[PDB]
Paper text:
Recent findings revealed that TNIP1 functions as a checkpoint mechanism that fine-tunes the rate of mitophagy by disrupting the recycling of the ULK complex during autophagosome formation. The phosphorylation of the TNIP1 FIR motif enhances its binding affinity for FIP200, enabling TNIP1 to compete with other autophagy receptors, such as CCPG1 or Optineurin. Here, we determined several crystal structures of the FIP200 claw domain in complex with phosphorylated TNIP1 FIR peptides and elucidated the specific recognition of different phosphorylated TNIP1 by FIP200 claw domain. Each FIP200 claw domain within the dimer features a five-stranded antiparallel β-sheet and a short α-helix.
Author numbering:
A (entry chain A): 1494 to 1542, 1551 to 1591
B (entry chain B): 103 to 111
Write the structure that this text describes.
């Protein structure tokens, strides 16, 4: 039970945590870059759109750029962030 | 959405 904390690659066991400032689930990381959990992943991890944290396995990642000021991620315009799909550890 | 686009690192 050891987790990656930055430079997430496919196959990494990761810690998925609720981020209330951004009102989404994110990968726990020491990097300043935001790794949002892809919304497709929520049922697979039994998270609804209150559980504080879960372990997951990274399976896909996507590099994105906010193109409007108000967005579902609550990040400023132009911000660049990742979207990650993850499944349950075991 | 048009909120965000995929971009190459
Ligand atoms: Mg982690």
């Amino acid at each position: 039970e050891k987790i990656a904390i930055r430079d997430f690659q496919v196959g990494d066991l990761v810690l998925i945590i609720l981020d209330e400032r951004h009102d989404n689930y994110v990968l726990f990381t020491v990097s300043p870059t935001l790794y949002f959990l892809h919304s497709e992943s929520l049922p697979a991890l039994d998270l609804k759109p209150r559980r504080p944290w879960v372990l997951g396995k990274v399976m896909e990642k996507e590099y994105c750029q906010a193109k409007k000021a108000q967005n579902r991620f609550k990040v400023p315009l132009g911000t660049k962030f990742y979207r990650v799909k993850a499944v349950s550890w075991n | 959405s048009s909120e965000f686009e995929v971009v190459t690192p």
